[PDB]
């Protein structure tokens, strides 16, 4: 007995190794990423996070790409230099092993991931994906 869990936690693509895809997070109220590697990496891989706004012309297409700021969590220290969120897939992460992170404070209605500059060489071997949690229609 397995449940049709596509409704009630659907999942969409966010980076297939060649292109980012904005995923709409308005209809839901919780979401997270589930990274996954396809072949051994060369060094640490860093990804930027972006959030979009409803476009000025059409209200159901994403607007431009704005970068989401990052908040501390009562014990932070690293404190990324230009107060802007980023995720770093650590080196020596094998395949058949997934990692799952999530930005705390949501903003906008479309979120997106993009390979940070200087790290788009071995970023074609990662494939980020998103999964939301609970419809609020």
């Amino acid at each position: 007995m397995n449940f049709n869990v596509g409704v009630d936690f659907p999942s969409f693509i966010a980076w297939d190794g060649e292109e980012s895809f904005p995923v709409k997070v308005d209809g839901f109220n919780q979401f997270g990423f589930t990274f996954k590697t396809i072949a051994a990496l060369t060094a640490a891989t860093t990804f930027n996070i972006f959030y979009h706004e409803p476009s000025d012309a059409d209200p159901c297409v994403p607007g431009p790409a704005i970068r989401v700021p990052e908040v501390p969590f009562c014990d932070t220290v690293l404190l990324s230099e230009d107060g802007l969120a980023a995720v770093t897939l650590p080196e020596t992460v094998t395949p058949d092993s997934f990692c799952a992170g999530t930005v705390p404070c949501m903003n906008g209605q479309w979120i997106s991931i993009a390979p940070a500059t200087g790290s788009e060489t071995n970023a074609a071997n990662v494939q980020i994906t998103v999964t939301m949690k609970g419809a609020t229609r």
Partner: peptide
């Protein structure tokens, strides 16, 4: 049958 969500079965 179970083709309807996973919030129904506690």
């Amino acid at each position: 049958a179970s083709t309807i969500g996973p919030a129904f079965f506690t």
